[PDB]
DNA sequence: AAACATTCGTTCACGTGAGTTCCAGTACAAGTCTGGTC
């Protein structure tokens, strides 16, 4: 971002989907439930940017979490 | 001759080692879900 102001804009990386454990993803899924919206192909968000990838439901930066990935 | 102390074989309680059953931790293997491209 401009100096001294948050990030506006994101740029998709790739899918993860092993590595939680199925306590760890009720507890994330729980987490993050209320914030999921539909995604539509015709008015996609303007903070997530993507690819031919997309996905079947995204969240606002804003109320996400940071993972970890090898 | 009578009273008191000592000794002996017995008795009970409590502690420790070996055998047996049951369960938790560990290992390994297979199954299931996922990711990426061409």
């Given at each position: 971002?401009?100096?001294g102001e948050?990030?506006?804009?994101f740029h998709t990386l790739s899918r993860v989907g092993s590595g939680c454990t199925?306590?760890?993803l009720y507890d994330?899924?729980?987490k993050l439930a209320k914030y999921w919206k539909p995604f539509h192909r015709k008015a996609p968000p303007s903070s997530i940017l993507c690819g031919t990838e997309k996905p079947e439901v995204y969240i606002?930066?804003?109320?996400s979490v940071?993972?970890?990935?090898?």
């Open positions: 971002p401009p100096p948050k990030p506006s804009v199925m306590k760890e994330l899924g729980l606002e930066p804003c109320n940071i993972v970890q990935i090898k």
